[PDB]
Amino acid sequence: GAPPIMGSSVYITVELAIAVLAILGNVLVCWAVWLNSNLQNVTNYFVVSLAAADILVGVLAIPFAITISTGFCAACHGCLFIACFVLVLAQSSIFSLLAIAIDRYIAIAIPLRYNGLVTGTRAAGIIAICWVLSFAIGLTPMLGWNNCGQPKEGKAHSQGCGEGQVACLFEDVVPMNYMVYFNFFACVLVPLLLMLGVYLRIFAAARRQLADLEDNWETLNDNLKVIEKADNAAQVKDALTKMRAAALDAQKMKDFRHGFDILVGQIDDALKLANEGKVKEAQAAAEQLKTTRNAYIQKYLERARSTLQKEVHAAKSAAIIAGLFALCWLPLHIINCFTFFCPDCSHAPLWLMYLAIVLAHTNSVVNPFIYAYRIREFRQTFRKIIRS
Numbered sequence: 399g400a401p402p403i404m405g406s407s408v409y410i411t412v413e414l415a416i417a418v419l420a421i422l423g424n425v426l427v428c429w430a431v432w433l434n435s436n437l438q439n440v441t442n443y444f445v446v447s448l449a450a451a452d453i454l455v456g457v458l459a460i461p462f463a464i465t466i467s468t469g470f471c472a473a474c475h476g477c478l479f480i481a482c483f484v485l486v487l488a489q490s491s492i493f494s495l496l497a498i499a500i501d502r503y504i505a506i507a508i509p510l511r512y513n514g515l516v517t518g519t520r521a522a523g524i525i526a527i528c529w530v531l532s533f534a535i536g537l538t539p540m541l542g543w544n545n546c547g548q549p550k551e552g553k554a555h556s557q558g559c560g561e562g563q564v565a566c567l568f569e570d571v572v573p574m575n576y577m578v579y580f581n582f583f584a585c586v587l588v589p590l591l592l593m594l595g596v597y598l599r600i601f602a603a604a605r606r607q608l609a610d611l612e613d614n615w616e617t618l619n620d621n622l623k624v625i626e627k628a629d630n631a632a633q634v635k636d637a638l639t640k641m642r643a644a645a646l647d648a649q650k651m652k653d654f655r656h657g658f659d660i661l662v663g664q665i666d667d668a669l670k671l672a673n674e675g676k677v678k679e680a681q682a683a684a685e686q687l688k689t690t691r692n693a694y695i696q697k698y699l700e701r702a703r704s705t706l707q708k709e710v711h712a713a714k715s716a717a718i719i720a721g722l723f724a725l726c727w728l729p730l731h732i733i734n735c736f737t738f739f740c741p742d743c744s745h746a747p748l749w750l751m752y753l754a755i756v757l758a759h760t761n762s763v764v765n766p767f768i769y770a771y772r773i774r775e776f777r778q779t780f781r782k783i784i785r786s
């Protein structure tokens with residue numbers, strides 16, 4: 399058996415390295431948003447929220463994990479706080495990730511009402527409640543759901559703890575049914591599945607909105623090819639009725655209104671020419687639609703096409719952040735599941751326990767890199783602060 403202090407030394411060095419990167423990179427996220435006003439949205443108030451959580455992982459959670467791994471003698475309720483504080487920070491990140499997903503869904507499904515419905519004053523309100531809730535979930539073991547009442551007193555005496563003290567070790571004070579049923583299943587896993595669903599609806603609503611754009615546009619010009627080589631007033635009449643409905647449907651800030659104001663006007667009067675039975679001037683009236691089409695309506699579907707793609711790009715960046723949360727945190731939850739559901743199994747070896755803790759702590763480093771690679775406003779603000 400190698401002295402504990404050398405394996406301890408690798409663990410502690412890596413933990414400290416992670417803390418440094420967690421705080422540095424996430425202090426940059428908070429500085430970017432404070433300085434650049436283009437980055438001050440409700441969306442970014444939640445990203446500043448989870449950057450705060452990531453900062454306090456480095457400043458508090460990682461120092462707590464280093465000390466909890468020594469088994470130091472302590473009063474059991476003080477042990478519980480050292481052991482559970484990181485669950486607060488994890489819960490807070492789950493709420494922040496959930497909020498940005500709902501925000502991005504509101505943005506895409508009802509852009510009309512978005513600015514009305516979502517506002518930075520209520521956002522700050524939601525954020526406070528989410529932190530209060532996060533303390534409640536994460537420190538529930540302190541309200542009595544703990545093993546403090548049945549200490550492992552042989553281990554306390556070996557360490558020579560004083561009276562009332564335990565050897566402070568995570569799996570000794572925190573019950574595993576808390577961790578698996580309450581923490582993992584109810585508070586982590588259910589919210590993640592909800593996120594999954596929100597992101598599915600977002601990409602679905604963006605895909606069918608693009609389809610509706612391209613449908614209205616191919617509806618516009620096939621009708622025109624129909625008027626083109628028609629027979630009589632009655633089918634030009636139909637080919638322009640299908641156009642105008644498609645115009646008003648596609649309509650749902652001043653040069654855009656003109657382009658449709660002309661288009662429907664041009665359709666409208668070709669309609670009355672058709673009704674009065676004049677066929678080929680009703681034709682002739684319907685092909686400088688072709689002109690308004692090239693000068694106006696196709697810049698509309700193009701920049702409309704351009705904006706939905708940005709929103710999908712923004713929603714995929716957010717999805718990556720949530721996926722990496724799940725990746726980095728599930729292994730540890732899965733191990734707890736084995737510990738709890740299979741008492742016939744050998745406990746996961748100590749080196750794997752600490753690999754899993756280290757990997758969950760690593761999640762606090764990755765988000766700043768995801769912003770810098772994926773959102774240009776963040777990337778250029780990072781560059782501007784660094785050079786200066």
Ligand SMILES: CC(C)CCC[C@@H](C)[C@H]1CC[C@H]2[C@H]3CC=C4C[C@@H](O)CC[C@]4(C)[C@@H]3CC[C@]12C
Nearest residue numbers: 458471472473474475476477478479480563566
């Ligand atoms: C705002 C920030 C800077 C303050 C951080 C406060 C932390 C460091 C404080 C708050 C509560 C503290 C202790 C709570 C009670 C106990 C039990 C005792 O037997 C050992 C010390 C121990 C385990 C704690 C040590 C650290 C402690 C956790």
Ligand SMILES: CC(C)CCC[C@@H](C)[C@H]1CC[C@H]2[C@H]3CC=C4C[C@@H](O)CC[C@]4(C)[C@@H]3CC[C@]12C
Nearest residue numbers: 724725728729730732733736743744745746747
């Ligand atoms: C990418 C993420 C989500 C998947 C992670 C899968 C990891 C966490 C899985 C893969 C294999 C798993 C277990 C395989 C079997 C053993 C031996 C058993 O006595 C304790 C649990 C233990 C030690 C494993 C626990 C964790 C485990 C390592």
Ligand SMILES: CC(C)CCC[C@@H](C)[C@H]1CC[C@H]2[C@H]3CC=C4C[C@@H](O)CC[C@]4(C)[C@@H]3CC[C@]12C
Nearest residue numbers: 587728731732733735736737738739740741743
């Ligand atoms: C990954 C996301 C989508 C869902 C999480 C699935 C988890 C809850 C699933 C995946 C693998 C599962 C089990 C794998 C095999 C074993 C050994 C058995 O003796 C007790 C159940 C136990 C320990 C697992 C229980 C939980 C289990 C870990």
Ligand SMILES: CCCCCCCC/C=C\CCCCCCCC(=O)OC[C@H](O)CO
Nearest residue numbers: 457458461462465470471472473480560563
């Ligand atoms: C805002 C920035 C401020 C930064 C804040 C720094 C965070 C504190 C660091 C580590 C806390 C862990 C300290 C707990 C260690 C206690 C050890 C102990 O209690 O020794 C007792 C002995 O074993 C017999 O009682």
Ligand SMILES: Nc1nc(NCCc2ccc(O)cc2)nc2nc(-c3ccco3)nn12
Nearest residue numbers: 485488567568569577730731734748751755
């Ligand atoms: N099971 C567990 N253990 C620890 N530390 C104890 C690692 C260990 C496990 C057994 C042992 O004999 C000595 C040390 N931290 C832990 N953190 C979590 C956790 C936090 C959030 C989700 O799971 N689980 N967890």
Ligand SMILES: CCCCCCCC/C=C\CCCCCCCC(=O)O
Nearest residue numbers: 456457458461464465466468470471
């Ligand atoms: C930005 C400020 C961050 C503050 C970090 C403080 C650094 C503390 C580093 C590790 C603390 C480990 C304490 C060891 C536990 C006591 C040992 C024992 O009781 O046996």
